[PDB]
Design a protein around this nucleic acid. Structure first.
Lengths: 559, 559
DNA sequence: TGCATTTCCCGTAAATCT
DNA sequence: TGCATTTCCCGTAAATCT
C-alpha cells in the first residue's frame, strides 16, 4: 500500500509531467511566432529598394515578443531542472534504496514485496519527462541558429540547460540498472547468495527505464571478482571465473509489463587456479565461508546522441566447493544482511559488527517460516535465547557476537549455535516435515521448564522437542512409566539420527510405541499432547499358491 | 608351471643364442684372417719392383680360406634366420596369443596368471639374438668393402640376410607392444572394459623387448575411436574423446624387472557432440550398452638405423554415461570375452554368438568368486540352469542365447536374467557381505526342491535363498509355525529391499526373530540351518543427572 | 600431523533425445 | 507419448593443501 511519501513523489512526478507539457505548448507558440517574424521580415525586404511601415512596427513588436517568450522559456526550464534534481534524489537515494534494503531482508527470509513495478513506473515517467525536456532545449538551440541578437537568452543559458539535463538523465539511467534477482542456485531457493562451484545458478538484471526503442539493443556482460581481484583491496582471497553464457541480450520477453530485463541461467563458477600473492597471514585471512565476492553486470547504452556506461553488482556472495559448507555459508549471508545496508563490503568479516538479540531472534524465525509452514513461538524462542545467554530475564538489548552465533562452538559443545539450528531446520523437512507443521511441537525448551508439565498436568501428557546435544540433529518427547513411580519421574528416549526416521515417522512413533516394563508387560505411548489434547486428533492423521508374511518394524524400549 | 611346449621354446631360444655366439667366434676368426691377408698383401708389394714366393702361395691360400669361411658364415646365417623365423611364430602366434586369451578370461573373473615375465624374457632373448645377428651381417658388409672378388658370397647373399633380419626384428618389436592392463575404473576393479564418461580410468602398456637403451626414449599416445569413427566400418555409433594426459613417456620405473612400461592414470572420456551420419536404422543400430570401442596406443621407435611404428589397442570397451547402465554393460563384456578370441570385433553385437550352458555356468561362478569369498555350488547353479531352461536333466550342451541371458527379460518378468543376478551379487556385498561368506547359504533353489527340507528334516531346520521375483534384489529363509500345523506348511517372509537391511543384518534377523501367533505368543526363529547345524555356531558370530533409554528395533511378524 | 578445503563419484531424480 | 539415455548434483569418502 502507498505511503504518504509515495503519494507525494507521485504528485511531484505529475507536476513535472505537466510542466513539460506546458513548456511544449510554449515552444509551439514561440516557433509559430518565429516563423511569422521570419516570413514578415522577408516580405518586407521584397520591397526594400505609401505609409506601409506599421509593418516595421509589427516586425519589431514580434521580435520583442520572441525575446520575452524565450526568457520565459529559459527561466521555466531552469526551474523544471531544479525540481527534477530534487525529486530524482527522492526517487533514487530514498525509495529505490528502501527497495534495495527490503531485497536484502527478503533474501534472508523476511517480509517480501520487493516489487519493482512502482519504481519502474516512476523512473520511466521521469526519464520520458527528461528526454522531452532535452528535445525542447535542443529546439531552442536550432531556433537560435535562425534568429539571434545581442542579449539573446538562448545563447546565455542553453549550454547550462543541456549540461544539467544530460547529467540528470545520465544519472537516472545508471540508478535504473539493478539486480532484480540475486545469484541463487535453483536447487537451493531459500539460499540465495551462496554458490557452489560447478553447480548452476541464475541471476537477473533489470533496467527500470522502460524504453521500447531499446528492446534487444543492449548486451549485458556478467563476471565475478572484476578488477578488485588485483590491487587497492582485499588480499589472499580465492579468485573465480564464470562459465556458461557470459553475455545476454536485454529484452522485454516473458510478457509481464514488458520490462527490460536480462536473465542469465546455467551459470557456473570455477576456481581460477595458479598465480600467487600471499594466501596466508592471520587465520589465512578469512575462512572460505567468510570470504565475499561480487558478481558484476555491465553494458553500454547509446541513445539519442549519448553514450552511457551502466554497471551494477549483486550482493556479496559466498563461494563454496562442497554442500557441507552451506550451513556456515548461510550464517555469513544472514549476518551480513541482518546488520548492514552497504551492498559491497567484501571485507565485512575482517571485523564483523555485533547484533542485538531482537534482530537475531527475528532472523531465526524467518529461517523456519521459509523452509516450513510457520516460524517460532516465544516458548521456543526465549528458551533458545537462554541457550546462547543462559539465565536472565528480558533479553531485548542483549548483544550477540558473530563468534557466539556461528564462528565458534557453543560453551561445552564441539559445534556452533547456527550449525546446530540449521541441522534442526533441515531434519524438520526430509523427515517430520508434515509433522512439524503448524503448532504441534514445542521444540525448544530446557529440561527445567520442561519439568513444568507432568509436574502440573496429569500422567500421560507429553511434549515434543529437539536433540540439544547432537550435531546432525534429532527429536524427542516426554512421559512417565518405570519402577513404582515415586512422584512421576519425567523421561525421554535416545535421539533418532537421520537414519532412524527413515524407518518410521516421528508421529508414527508417538502413535505406536509401548514400553516393555520388567518382562512381557508392553504398556503404551502416553495420551494428551502438552495442554490436554489426546494423541490421535493431532498425530493420528500422519499415520497409515500364496503368500509371503507382510511386515512392519517397531522399536519399543526393552529394559 | 612350465608346459612341455614352453620347455621346447626355451630350448630353441638357447639354441639360437648358441648359434649367434658360434657365429660371433667365426666372425672374429675371419676378420683376423682378413687382417693378416691384407697386411701380407701389402708387405708383398713393398718389394714388387731369392725364391721368396711361397708367400705368393701363402697369400692365395689365405684368400681361398677367407672365401670358404665366408660361404660357411653366409650359409649358417641363412640357417639361423630360418630357425628364428620358425620360433618367432611359436613365440608370437602361440604363446603370446595364449596369454592374450588368458587376459580376456582373467578380466571376466577367471583363473588368473596373466604374468608376462616369461614372455618378456623369451622375447628379449630373441631380440638380443637378432640385433647381434644384424651386426654380424653388417660386419660382413664392411669386410666386403675391403676385400672382394668374383663369386664373393657376401655380395650374392648379404642383401637377403639384411632383409630377413630386419623383417624379423621389425615384427618382433610390433608383437612385443601390448596392453598389460586393460581400461578400468579404479572405483570398479571387478569391472574392467566398462567406462563411464567423466570418471577416471587407468590402463597400461608394455614393450616386451627389455632394452635399457630405450628407457625414457618413447612417447606413447593414447586415443579412443581412432580413424574407424569415419568410413569402412560401423555406423551410427556415439564417438568419444579422451581427456587428461593424452601422452606418456615409457620408462622402467616402479622397479620390478625394470620393464619398459607406460601407465596412464586419470584418463577421462567425453562424448564428442555434433556432426551427423545417421544414428537411427534398426533398433538405433545397437543399444548403447552393446556398442563397442577401442582405445588405441601408438608410438614410434628409432633404433640402430631403423624406424618402427608400434600400435596396439585395448579389448573392446563399453562406454556408459550413468552407473545404472553398469549391469548391462558388464553382461556385454562377459559375453564378448566368454565367446570370442577376436580382440577387435566392434560389431560383435550385430549378430551375437550363442553359448553353451557349460561356458555360461563357469562365467556365472566367477562373478561370485570375484566380489566375494567363494563361487557357486551346483545346488545353486543347477537350480538356476532351470530358471533359464525350466524342467530337464543334464544341461551339458544346452544352448543359451544373448537374448535369453540379458538382451530380453525372463519369461514372465519385467527384467533380465543377468540384471537380476548382478543385483544379487551386488546386495550380497553392501549388506550380508560377511554373512554370504563361505557356505552358509543355499541362495538358489526352487520351492519344489526347497520342499525337500522340512519335508525330510525335523521342525526348525531352515534354508537361505534370494528374492526370485524382484528386480533390485532380496533375501529370505524357511520355517514352520502357524494354525495347528497340518503336516508342517513351509513358510517365508516378504523380501527386504536394500533399505530393509540397513536396520538389521540378515543373520541378526535369523538370530533374533520370533512370531506373534494369535495374540501375545511371540514364539521364535527356527534352529538348525539346513543339514543339522543349530543356529548360533553359524550365525551367532555376526551378531553384537541421567539418562536416555538406549534403543534397538525388531520387526517380528504380527498376524 | 591435523585441519581446512576441494575433488571424486554413486545413485536418485530430472532433463533431453528420438 | 513413452523410451532410451544423459545430465544434474547431494552427500559420503577420499584426496590435497597448508
Amino acid at each position: 500500500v502507498v505511503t504518504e511519501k509515495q503519494q507525494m513523489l507521485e504528485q511531484h512526478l505529475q507536476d513535472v509531467r505537466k510542466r513539460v507539457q506546458d513548456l511544449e505548448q510554449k515552444m509551439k507558440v514561440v516557433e509559430n511566432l518565429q516563423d511569422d517574424f521570419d516570413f514578415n521580415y522577408k516580405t518586407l525586404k521584397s520591397q526594400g529598394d505609401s505609409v506601409t511601415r506599421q509593418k516595421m512596427q509589427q516586425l519589431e513588436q514580434m521580435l520583442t515578443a520572441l525575446d520575452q517568450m524565450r526568457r520565459s522559456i529559459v527561466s521555466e526550464l531552469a526551474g523544471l531542472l531544479s525540481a527534477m534534481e530534487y525529486v530524482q534524489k527522492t526517487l533514487t537515494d530514498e525509495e529505490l534504496a528502501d527497495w534495495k534494503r527490503r531485497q536484502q531482508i527478503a533474501c534472508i527470509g523476511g517480509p517480501p514485496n520487493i516489487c519493482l513495478d512502482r519504481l519502474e513506473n516512476w523512473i520511466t515517467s521521469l526519464a520520458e519527462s527528461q528526454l522531452q525536456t532535452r528535445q525542447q532545449i535542443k529546439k531552442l538551440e536550432e531556433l537560435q541558429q535562425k534568429v539571434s541578437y545581442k542579449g539573446d537568452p538562448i545563447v546565455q543559458h542553453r549550454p547550462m540547460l543541456e549540461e544539467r539535463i544530460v547529467e540528470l538523465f545520465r544519472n537516472l539511467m545508471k540508478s535504473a540498472f539493478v539486480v532484480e534477482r540475486q545469484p541463487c542456485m535453483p536447487m537451493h531457493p531459500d539460499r540465495p547468495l551462496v554458490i557452489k562451484t560447478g553447480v548452476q545458478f541464475t541471476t537477473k538484471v533489470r533496467l527500470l527505464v522502460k524504453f521500447p526503442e531499446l528492446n534487444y539493443q543492449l548486451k549485458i556482460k556478467v563476471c565475478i571478482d572484476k578488477d578488485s581481484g588485483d590491487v587497492a583491496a582485499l588480499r589472499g582471497s580465492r579468485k573465480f571465473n564464470i562459465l556458461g553464457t557470459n553475455t545476454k541480450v536485454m529484452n522485454m520477453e516473458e510478457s509481464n509489463n514488458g520490462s527490460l530485463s536480462a536473465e542469465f541461467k546455467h551459470l557456473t563458477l570455477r576456481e581460477q587456479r595458479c598465480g600467487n600473492g600471499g594466501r596466508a597471514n592471520c587465520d589465512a585471512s578469512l575462512i572460505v565461508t567468510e570470504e565475499l565476492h561480487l558478481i558484476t553486470f555491465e553494458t553500454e547504452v547509446y541513445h539519442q546522441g549519448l553514450k552511457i556506461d551502466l554497471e551494477t553488482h549483486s550482493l556479496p556472495v559466498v563461494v563454496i566447493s562442497n554442500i557441507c559448507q552451506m550451513p556456515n555459508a548461510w550464517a555469513s549471508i544472514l549476518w551480513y544482511n541482518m546488520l548492514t545496508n552497504n551492498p559491497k563490503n567484501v571485507n565485512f568479516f575482517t571485523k564483523p559488527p555485533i547484533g542485538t538479540w531482537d534482530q537475531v531472534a527475528e532472523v531465526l524465525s524467518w529461517q523456519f517460516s521459509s523452509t516450513t509452514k510457520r516460524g517460532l513461538s516465544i516458548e521456543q524462542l526465549t528458551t533458545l535465547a537462554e541457550k546462547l545467554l543462559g539465565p536472565g530475564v528480558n533479553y531485548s538489548g542483549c548483544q550477540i557476537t558473530w563468534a557466539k552465533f556461528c564462528k565458534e562452538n557453543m560453551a561445552g559443545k564441539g559445534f556452533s549455535f547456527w550449525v546446530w539450528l540449521d541441522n534442526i531446520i533441515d531434519l524438520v523437512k526430509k523427515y517430520i516435515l508434515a509433522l512439524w507443521n503448524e503448532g504441534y511441537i514445542m521444540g525448544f525448551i530446557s529440561k527445567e521448564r520442561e519439568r513444568a508439565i507432568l509436574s502440573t498436568k496429569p500422567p500421560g501428557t507429553f511434549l515434543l522437542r529437539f536433540s540439544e546435544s547432537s550435531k546432525e540433529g534429532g527429536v524427542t518427547f516426554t512421559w512417565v512409566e518405570k519402577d513404582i513411580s515415586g512422584s512421576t519421574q519425567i523421561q525421554s528416549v535416545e535421539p533418532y539420527t537421520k537414519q532412524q526416521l527413515n524407518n518410521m515417522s516421528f508421529a508414527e512413533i508417538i502413535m505406536g510405541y509401548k514400553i516393555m516394563d520388567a518382562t512381557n508387560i508392553l504398556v503404551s505411548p502416553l495420551v494428551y499432547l502438552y495442554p490436554d489434547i489426546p494423541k490421535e486428533e493431532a498425530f493420528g492423521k500422519y499415520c497409515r499358491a500364496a503368500p509371503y508374511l507382510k511386515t512392519k518394524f517397531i522399536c519399543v524400549t526393552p529394559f
